[PDB]
């Protein structure tokens, strides 16, 4: 849900037809003034590919940086990361089928 | 203010306008923004005259102006001369000049007190300048540039000169004119500063492509704050 709040915030700033660098400066100023929604964001924004990046706590003090598409839901981005996981497994099985004949 | 203005796209305002303390002259073929800049900044205290000199839209390079007097070339017609006589206040004196170089804005760089001229002007024209303008005259070149009006912008407070000017020439001209001078550029690096802009005691008007450091140099040397 908090990722959806961050997405709604960035999309509301986008829908004002505001300049991207002014949006990044607004994110920096609100991070300095201690807004949580701003402080969850990482500043090199990929608005050219409609993608933001967000910091999530690994343990419920280390934070991980995850890229979120603005045109899909947060659950839909999670399903994309699951899909990239699932495609990686099939290539690994193809490698395991390769190993014996290749090394022979 | 150094006010950003264009003459229909032209970033050279000194070519198409002549600004003194007492009056202003603008070309007849001008845009609404170009007239509105002088009308808003100058106000109703100072007359603005839409004029043509010798059938040409260029008036700043054709004429040399002062608060006491105005100099016009020989080719200026009687209708234009009478219109300037009616539109101008009674204080200023308008006198035709009969001289071969005939482009008085290029030839003469002048202010209220002291003037720089082309070295090769005629002695009768020098005495005519000293009479009508009431201004002491020096024949000098700005680092070998004979067109002192085109290559210098001068006011009472200070002056802007050509960028490629020798420093020794800078203190020599500064001591000769009794004003501080700065070498600088106008209109995104154009060398012709006097053609680039017009200035007086409280206003400077320049082209739109004049950058912010150039505008800061303008307001610093002309003390417009």
């Amino acid at each position: 849900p908090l990722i959806e709040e961050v997405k709604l915030a960035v999309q509301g700033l986008i829908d004002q037809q505001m300049d991207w660098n002014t949006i990044e400066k607004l994110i920096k100023s609100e991070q300095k003034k201690g807004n949580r929604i701003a402080q969850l964001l990482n500043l090199p924004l990929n608005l050219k590919q409609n993608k933001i990046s967000v910091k999530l706590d690994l343990s419920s003090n280390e934070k991980i940086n995850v890229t979120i598409d603005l045109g899909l839901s947060a659950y839909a981005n999670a399903t994309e990361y699951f899909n990239i996981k699932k495609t990686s497994a099939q290539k690994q099985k193809k490698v395991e089928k390769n190993v014996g004949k290749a090394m022979k | 203010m150094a006010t950003r203005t264009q003459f229909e796209n032209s970033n050279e305002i000194g070519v198409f306008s002549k600004l003194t303390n007492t009056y202003c002259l603008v070309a007849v073929g001008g845009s609404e923004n170009f007239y509105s800049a002088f009308e808003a900044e100058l106000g109703d205290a100072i007359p603005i005259v839409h004029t043509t000199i010798a059938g040409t839209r260029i008036i700043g390079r054709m004429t040399a102006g002062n608060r006491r007097g105005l100099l016009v070339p020989t080719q200026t017609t009687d209708q234009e001369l009478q219109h300037l006589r009616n539109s101008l206040p009674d204080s200023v004196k308008i006198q035709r000049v009969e001289e071969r170089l005939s482009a008085l804005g290029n030839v003469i760089c002048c202010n209220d007190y002291v003037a720089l001229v082309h070295p090769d002007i005629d002695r009768e024209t020098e005495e005519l300048i000293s009479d009508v303008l009431g201004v002491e005259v020096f024949r000098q070149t700005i680092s070998g540039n004979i067109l002192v009006g085109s290559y210098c912008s001068l006011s009472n407070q200070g002056g802007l000169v050509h960028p490629q000017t020798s420093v020794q020439d800078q203190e020599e001209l500064s001591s000769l004119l009794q004003v501080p001078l700065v070498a600088g550029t106008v209109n995104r690096g154009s060398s012709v500063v006097g053609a680039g802009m017009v200035v007086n005691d409280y206003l400077a008007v320049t082209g739109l492509d004049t950058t912010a450091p150039e505008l800061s140099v303008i307001e610093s040397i002309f003390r417009l704050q």
Binding site: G12 | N33, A212
Partner: protein
């Protein structure tokens, strides 16, 4: 027509300058009018005016302001147009406009607000708290052209009553202070001006001009309100502590010493109030910066910095009195800085420079800051010699020489030594004799009324006639 939501702003809940529920701020990025309010405006014409004001290009902004003014001028027909919604939106945009580089934009915006107050009197009461501080900041802007008209209009708005103008300073003083704090502490050069469209310099220049206005306002606020220090001490401390006001005291670079002068006035005013004495840290920070400024003056910039020098010395003399020359003690090298400053300063003399130097001497003599004979006299003698050679070539020279003599004569009196007496006589003779045309300038001769007993001067005249 207007789309989007300022979701980020809702979380913040800081209204900056504004007290009516809309954030009003100088920075370009935030404080922009909310899209929903913009739609709520009464007429389409008004909405278009707002979009144009938002656009960066100046010609477009100016055209929109001209249109808005025309609408306000025809107030009777358009009274319905200007509602609370218009005023809330205007207030947010006005703040950005007053910091604009272009003077016309600044002037027009100020004129427009004043017109609104006159026309909508008693209905702008809710918004007076937002508008009044900004209007005043404009009236205390360094440029004469923006300030003078604005003040005249304000006075006219209040029916030419001096009391009302003064009252305004008193009534909104807390708010006026908040504006100053915001410029000084909250803002930075980058926040005020966009980096992409401006250089490292210019951005600095702009910030400095805006901050100077804030300081001028602060000085005015202090003068107008006697009790300001006590009521707003916490706010005052934060503004004063920040180095931004003090960074203005740099003479190495910068177009004018006018901003630097404004800071000097503030330090003096604070000392008179006793705030600087009361809070030691603020005073020490200010003093150290002032000492650093003395080093900045150099031969290259001496002509540029000459008008401000009499003022600098005068402030120093007043500060020295505090704490028995405690100000010199703060810096280990202060004496060296002063000596260097004096050496650079003497070469170019400006009117009132000598009086300042004597004042410094008067404060320092009790605590022996400068050796009278080894250190001070050399300074005096060299000075007269310099004055004579370039003499009386400049205009006001007559006044400058007169000053030297009056001051030196006083300095000499506190010597009781032969060398000083000898120097005075010899120098006087040299100054009169090489001279220029001292007698010819009657005023100069009058101002320099005499330097010695009357009969002796006659004996010297006798020698000139008797000479070969």
């Amino acid at each position: 027509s207007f789309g989007g939501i300022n979701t980020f702003q809702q979380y913040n809940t800081d209204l900056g300058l504004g007290h009516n529920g809309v954030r009003i701020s100088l920075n370009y990025f935030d404080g922009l009018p909310d899209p929903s309010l913009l739609n709520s405006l009464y007429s389409n014409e008004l909405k278009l005016i707002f979009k144009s004001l938002l656009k960066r290009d100046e010609t477009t902004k100016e055209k929109a302001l001209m249109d808005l003014s025309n609408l306000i001028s025809d107030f009777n027909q358009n009274e319905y147009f200007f509602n609370d919604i218009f005023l809330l939106c205007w207030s947010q945009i006005y703040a950005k406009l007053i910091i604009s580089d272009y003077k016309v934009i600044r002037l027009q915006s100020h004129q427009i607000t004043i017109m609104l107050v006159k026309s909508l009197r008693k209905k702008i009461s809710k918004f007076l708290k937002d508008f009044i501080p900004l209007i005043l900041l404009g009236t205390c802007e360094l440029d004469y052209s923006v300030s003078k008209p604005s003040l005249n209009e304000l006075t006219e708005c209040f029916n030419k009553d001096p009391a009302k103008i003064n009252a305004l300073w008193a009534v909104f003083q807390e708010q006026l202070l908040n504006l100053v704090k915001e410029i000084v502490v909250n803002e930075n050069e980058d926040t005020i001006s966009d980096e992409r469209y401006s250089s490292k310099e210019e951005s600095e220049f702009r910030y400095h001009r805006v901050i100077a206005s804030a300081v001028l306002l602060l000085i005015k606020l202090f003068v107008h309100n006697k009790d300001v220090s006590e009521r707003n001490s916490s706010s005052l401390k934060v503004i004063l502590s920040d180095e931004s006001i003090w960074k203005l005291l740099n003479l190495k670079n910068g177009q004018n010493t006018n901003a630097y002068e404004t800071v000097l006035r503030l330090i003096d005013v604070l000392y008179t109030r006793g705030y600087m004495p009361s809070h030691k840290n603020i005073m020490k920070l200010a003093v150290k910066k002032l000492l650093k400024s003395l080093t900045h003056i150099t031969s290259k910039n001496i002509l540029k910095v000459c008008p401000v020098l009499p003022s600098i010395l005068n402030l120093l003399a007043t500060l020295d009195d505090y704490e028995d020359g405690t100000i010199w003690s703060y810096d280990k090298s202060s004496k060296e800085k002063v000596l260097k400053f004096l050496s650079v300063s003497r070469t170019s003399p400006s009117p009132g420079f000598f009086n300042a130097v004597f004042a410094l001497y008067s404060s320092t003599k009790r605590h022996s800051f400068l050796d009278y004979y080894l250190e001070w006299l050399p300074f005096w003698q060299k000075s007269v010699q310099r004055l004579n050679e370039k003499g009386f070539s400049a205009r006001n020279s007559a006044e400058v020489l007169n000053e030297f003599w009056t001051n030196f004569l006083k300095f000499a009196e506190d010597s009781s030594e032969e060398r000083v007496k000898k120097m005075v006589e010899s120098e006087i003779f040299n100054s009169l004799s090489c001279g220029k045309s001292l007698s010819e300038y009657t005023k100069l001769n009058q101002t320099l009324s005499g330097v010695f007993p009357p009969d002796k001067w006659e004996r010297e005249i006798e020698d000139y006639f008797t000479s070969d």
